[PDB]
Scaffold this motif. Structure first.
Motif, PDB file in Angstrom:
ATOM      1  N   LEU A  16       1.195  -1.152   0.058  1.00  0.00           N
ATOM      2  CA  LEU A  16       0.336   0.209   0.271  1.00  0.00           C
ATOM      3  C   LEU A  16       0.979   1.576   0.295  1.00  0.00           C
ATOM      4  O   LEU A  16       0.392   2.376  -0.758  1.00  0.00           O
ATOM      5  N   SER A  17       1.946   1.672   0.900  1.00  0.00           N
ATOM      6  CA  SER A  17       2.810   2.473   0.941  1.00  0.00           C
ATOM      7  C   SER A  17       3.826   2.135  -0.647  1.00  0.00           C
ATOM      8  O   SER A  17       3.821   3.902  -0.645  1.00  0.00           O
ATOM      9  N   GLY A  18       3.633   1.557  -1.154  1.00  0.00           N
ATOM     10  CA  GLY A  18       4.223   1.398  -2.486  1.00  0.00           C
ATOM     11  C   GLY A  18       3.590   2.067  -3.186  1.00  0.00           C
ATOM     12  O   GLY A  18       3.783   3.489  -4.078  1.00  0.00           O
ATOM     13  N   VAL A  19       2.346   1.875  -3.183  1.00  0.00           N
ATOM     14  CA  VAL A  19       1.143   2.580  -4.057  1.00  0.00           C
ATOM     15  C   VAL A  19       1.393   3.784  -4.253  1.00  0.00           C
ATOM     16  O   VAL A  19       1.073   4.781  -4.879  1.00  0.00           O
ATOM     17  N   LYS A  20       1.342   4.071  -3.176  1.00  0.00           N
ATOM     18  CA  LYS A  20       1.177   5.726  -2.501  1.00  0.00           C
ATOM     19  C   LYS A  20       2.419   6.574  -2.649  1.00  0.00           C
ATOM     20  O   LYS A  20       1.794   7.860  -3.214  1.00  0.00           O
ATOM     21  N   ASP A  21       3.334   5.888  -2.517  1.00  0.00           N
ATOM     22  CA  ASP A  21       4.430   7.109  -3.269  1.00  0.00           C
ATOM     23  C   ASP A  21       4.766   7.399  -4.775  1.00  0.00           C
ATOM     24  O   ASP A  21       4.895   8.074  -5.289  1.00  0.00           O
ATOM     25  N   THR A  22       4.429   5.747  -5.847  1.00  0.00           N
ATOM     26  CA  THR A  22       4.584   5.816  -6.693  1.00  0.00           C
ATOM     27  C   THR A  22       3.604   6.569  -7.369  1.00  0.00           C
ATOM     28  O   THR A  22       3.294   7.246  -8.622  1.00  0.00           O
ATOM     29  N   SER A  24       2.179   9.406  -6.216  1.00  0.00           N
ATOM     30  CA  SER A  24       2.466  10.470  -5.777  1.00  0.00           C
ATOM     31  C   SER A  24       3.821  11.238  -7.051  1.00  0.00           C
ATOM     32  O   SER A  24       3.360  11.900  -7.609  1.00  0.00           O
ATOM     33  N   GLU A  25       4.639  10.149  -7.250  1.00  0.00           N
ATOM     34  CA  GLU A  25       5.749  10.521  -8.047  1.00  0.00           C
ATOM     35  C   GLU A  25       5.243  10.586  -9.753  1.00  0.00           C
ATOM     36  O   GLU A  25       6.068  11.113 -10.570  1.00  0.00           O
ATOM     37  N   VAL A  26       4.490   9.458  -9.936  1.00  0.00           N
ATOM     38  CA  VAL A  26       3.995  10.095 -11.498  1.00  0.00           C
ATOM     39  C   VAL A  26       3.358  10.809 -11.163  1.00  0.00           C
ATOM     40  O   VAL A  26       2.658  11.334 -13.011  1.00  0.00           O
ATOM     41  N   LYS A  27       2.332  11.195 -10.278  1.00  0.00           N
ATOM     42  CA  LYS A  27       1.333  12.345 -10.555  1.00  0.00           C
ATOM     43  C   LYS A  27       2.345  13.793 -10.478  1.00  0.00           C
ATOM     44  O   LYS A  27       2.708  15.119 -11.549  1.00  0.00           O
ATOM     45  N   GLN A  28       3.589  14.170 -10.442  1.00  0.00           N
ATOM     46  CA  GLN A  28       4.825  15.356 -11.139  1.00  0.00           C
ATOM     47  C   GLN A  28       5.414  14.819 -12.178  1.00  0.00           C
ATOM     48  O   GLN A  28       5.754  15.982 -12.413  1.00  0.00           O
TER      49      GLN A  28
ATOM     50  N   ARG B   3      -7.904  -1.676  -1.222  1.00  0.00           N
ATOM     51  CA  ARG B   3      -8.380  -1.425  -1.570  1.00  0.00           C
ATOM     52  C   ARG B   3      -9.052   0.294  -2.555  1.00  0.00           C
ATOM     53  O   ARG B   3      -8.243   0.366  -3.700  1.00  0.00           O
ATOM     54  N   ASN B   4      -8.699   0.982  -1.513  1.00  0.00           N
ATOM     55  CA  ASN B   4      -8.446   2.298  -2.066  1.00  0.00           C
ATOM     56  C   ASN B   4      -7.037   2.579  -3.004  1.00  0.00           C
ATOM     57  O   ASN B   4      -6.892   3.867  -3.372  1.00  0.00           O
ATOM     58  N   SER B   5      -5.802   2.471  -2.166  1.00  0.00           N
ATOM     59  CA  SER B   5      -4.852   3.135  -2.304  1.00  0.00           C
ATOM     60  C   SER B   5      -4.453   2.123  -3.196  1.00  0.00           C
ATOM     61  O   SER B   5      -4.268   3.153  -4.708  1.00  0.00           O
ATOM     62  N   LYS B  11      -6.366   6.136 -10.768  1.00  0.00           N
ATOM     63  CA  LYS B  11      -6.296   7.361 -11.017  1.00  0.00           C
ATOM     64  C   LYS B  11      -5.223   8.510 -11.503  1.00  0.00           C
ATOM     65  O   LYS B  11      -4.452   8.876 -11.928  1.00  0.00           O
ATOM     66  N   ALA B  12      -3.994   7.569 -10.691  1.00  0.00           N
ATOM     67  CA  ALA B  12      -2.541   8.393 -11.075  1.00  0.00           C
ATOM     68  C   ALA B  12      -1.925   7.877 -12.830  1.00  0.00           C
ATOM     69  O   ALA B  12      -1.758   8.795 -12.732  1.00  0.00           O
ATOM     70  N   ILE B  13      -1.929   6.604 -13.227  1.00  0.00           N
ATOM     71  CA  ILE B  13      -1.708   5.954 -14.176  1.00  0.00           C
ATOM     72  C   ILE B  13      -2.776   6.454 -15.020  1.00  0.00           C
ATOM     73  O   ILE B  13      -2.486   7.196 -16.390  1.00  0.00           O
ATOM     74  N   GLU B  14      -3.936   6.920 -15.020  1.00  0.00           N
ATOM     75  CA  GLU B  14      -4.917   7.794 -15.820  1.00  0.00           C
ATOM     76  C   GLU B  14      -4.758   9.153 -15.549  1.00  0.00           C
ATOM     77  O   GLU B  14      -4.699   8.849 -16.876  1.00  0.00           O
TER      78      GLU B  14
END
Lengths: 56, 61
Positions: A16-22, A24-28, B3-5, B11-14
């Motif tokens: 989950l943490s790796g998900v969130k940080d990647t 943020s990085e892809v948003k940048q 799930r929400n993560s 959404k980020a990949i979209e």
């Protein structure tokens, strides 16, 4: 037993943490990439303005 | 929460695919703009030199 329980907890937490940080990085990445996109677009259309003004 | 993560990842990949999609679309549009700008730079001095020859005939004859 501590290894096993802390291990599955670390599995779910790590993913989950790796998900969130990647995320943020892809948003940048998108912000930077679209900035350079419209910058290069201004550059190409500015080359158009340049060739227009030069032939003028 | 797991799930929400995954959903925020989605959404980020979209937004990623939005970025690359707009990159490609606008770069092809600026390519067509480059073609038509080459054409507009072709079409100018010919008109102006034909105007010069208009003045030529308008004075000498």
């Amino acid at each position: 037993l501590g290894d096993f329980m802390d291990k599955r907890d670390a599995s779910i937490k790590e993913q989950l943490s790796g998900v969130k940080d990647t995320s943020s990085e892809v948003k940048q990445l998108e912000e930077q990439a679209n900035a350079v996109m419209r910058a290069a677009r201004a550059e190409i259309s500015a080359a158009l303005n340049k060739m227009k003004k030069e032939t003028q | 929460t797991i799930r929400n993560s995954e959903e925020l990842r989605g959404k980020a990949i979209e937004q990623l695919e939005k970025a690359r999609a707009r990159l490609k679309k606008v770069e092809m549009d600026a390519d067509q703009f480059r073609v038509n700008g080459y054409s507009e730079i072709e079409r100018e001095k010919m008109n102006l030199i034909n105007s010069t020859y208009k003045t030529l005939e308008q004075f000498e004859n």
